[PDB]
Amino acid sequence: GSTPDYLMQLMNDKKLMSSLPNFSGIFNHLERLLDEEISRVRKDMYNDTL
Amino acid sequence: GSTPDYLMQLMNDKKLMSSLPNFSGIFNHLERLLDEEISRVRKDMYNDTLN
Ligand SMILES: [Ca+2]
Numbered sequence: 105g106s107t108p109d110y111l112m113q114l115m116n117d118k119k120l121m122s123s124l125p126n127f128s129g130i131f132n133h134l135e136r137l138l139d140e141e142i143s144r145v146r147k148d149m150y151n152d153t154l
Numbered sequence: 155g156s157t158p159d160y161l162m163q164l165m166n167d168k169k170l171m172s173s174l175p176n177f178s179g180i181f182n183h184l185e186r187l188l189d190e191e192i193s194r195v196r197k198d199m200y201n202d203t204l205n
Contacts, residue, residue, distance in 0.1 A: 113182040120181060127177060131170060132163040137187050 106149040114142045158199065164192050 121128050121135050128135045171178045171185050178185050 117181045117184050121184075131167045133191070134167055134171075134184065134188060137191050138184060141183070141187050 106152050111145050161195050
């Protein structure tokens, strides 16, 4: 039984990062790490179905 | 040994985040994910050594 609240919070962080490409551009890895966490979360929620 | 380039880039990102508390504070999880990746990287580099 999975909870969407975490995923929802992450995607709001992601929307925000997308809105600030100038800030994102001064970090080496920051936005990629958020993307990877989001992919991980979605995979987990789906796999707790199988 | 060296050069541990990925770790240095991450730790630079972390210092930059610390330097920008107002920017960091508008996100729910962003800085923690960075902290977690750093710990993971240091752990892997150390474990690769016990081989
Ligand atoms: Ca922190």
